[PDB]
């Protein structure tokens, strides 16, 4: 089945209980599906965000149309929309309780791989439409091969090791130098200053 | 001689659903104005026109404005007229939907969708605060073939 599988709008059995909007699921680096699996090419998420069924349909249609079924194959590296987002009836004042489940979505964290391509095909043969899909995506995304991913990572360690600035965000935050922990989040100690909200700053060491 | 044309009638505006509120009358009642009708596309026969070069291959009947607040209605879509030579057979699927031979003759190809009602339209003694606002009906979209 060398084609991208269809993703349902919502799980067959919905969540009766409304759950809170824990934005930590979008905040911070991704810890799952951060490495290539049975593929060579992928769309890397350079920022956190929520993927709707609309985004899923966009990705599926574009990739299926613009890939060769016999040689190129695609695989989802993100679960189908499962987190329920509730929208109150339009035009109602605040209060009265949490609204009903309007839609379903899937969280995605920075560094996460959304779709993974593979097969007998080089990187430039796929860069075009993968980058178009990345631009379409709701968060900063990049068409990254295994080689490009490793290259950018190694460049990150190179920047960290050769930066001539005596002062690093990690050093200052961990040491609580200027009392800056009065202004930083406890998560900043682990984000090392490279993450702000759902945005990831690759340029920053 | 022969032209395939895509006439798309206008779409009626969707009625608004709002409610009035003024200093000394807070619950002033519905203000949802009705939407304007879509402008029909009518092929009018023209004696001066002798060939179907003039007629375009894509006609989009103007859509009516949506109803506003304060019971404001929506300007209905203006009628789009396609000047055609005298003696122009109009066929959908080999149906000869029209002949259009006489001067002054005209055939309505795509009727603009009617405008949607507002809540004030449904206002009544029984219904003292309607929330309904019927959506503006879509306009007709058909492919007509013109043969001299």
């Amino acid at each position: 089945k060398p084609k991208l599988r269809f993703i349902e709008r919502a799980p067959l059995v919905p969540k009766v209980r409304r759950e809170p909007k824990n934005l930590s699921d979008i905040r911070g680096p991704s810890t799952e599906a951060t490495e290539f699996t049975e593929g060579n090419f992928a769309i890397l998420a350079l920022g956190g965000g929520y993927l709707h069924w609309g985004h899923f349909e966009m990705m599926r249609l574009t990739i299926n149309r613009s890939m060769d079924p016999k040689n190129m194959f695609a695989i989802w590296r993100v679960p189908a929309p499962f987190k329920p987002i509730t929208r109150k009836s339009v035009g109602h004042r605040m209060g009265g309780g949490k609204g009903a489940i309007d839609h379903y979505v899937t969280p995605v964290k920075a560094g996460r791989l959304v779709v993974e391509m593979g097969g007998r095909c080089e990187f430039e043969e796929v860069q075009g439409f993968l980058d178009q899909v990345a631009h379409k995506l709701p968060f900063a995304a990049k068409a990254v091969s295994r080689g490009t991913l490793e290259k950018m990572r190694k460049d990150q360690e190179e920047r960290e090791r050769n930066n001539q600035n005596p002062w690093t965000f990690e050093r200052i935050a961990t040491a609580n130098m200027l009392g800056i922990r009065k202004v930083l989040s406890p998560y900043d100690l682990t984000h090392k200053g490279k993450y702000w909200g759902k945005f990831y700053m690759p340029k920053r060491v | 001689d022969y032209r395939r044309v895509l006439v798309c009638g206008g779409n009626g505006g969707a009625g608004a659903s709002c409610f009035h509120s003024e200093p000394r009358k807070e619950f002033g009642g519905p203000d949802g104005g009705d939407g304007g009708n879509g402008g029909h596309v009518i092929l009018r026969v023209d004696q001066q026109v002798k060939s179907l070069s003039s007629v375009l291959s894509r006609y989009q009947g103007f859509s009516g404005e949506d109803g506003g607040s304060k019971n404001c209605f929506g300007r209905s879509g203006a009628v789009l007229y396609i000047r055609v030579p005298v003696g122009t057979l109009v066929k959908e699927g080999g149906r000869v939907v029209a002949d259009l031979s006489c001067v002054g003759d005209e055939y309505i190809a795509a009727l603009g969708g009617a405008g949607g009602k507002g809540n004030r339209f449904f206002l009544a003694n029984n219904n003292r605060a309607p929330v309904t606002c019927t959506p503006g009906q879509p306009g007709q979209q058909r492919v007509l073939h013109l043969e001299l």
Binding site: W167, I172, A175, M177, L178 | -
Partner: protein, 42 residues
Amino acid sequence: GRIPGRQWIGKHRRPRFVSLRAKQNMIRRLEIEAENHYWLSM
């Protein structure tokens, strides 16, 4: 060109920019505290 609401508090605030003078002040304080760390380390 006006900033909606009240400056420095709302979602839309006056953009604030760091001057070289501010960076130098912060670096000076950081150096002082690095020396403090060294002298507390023994």
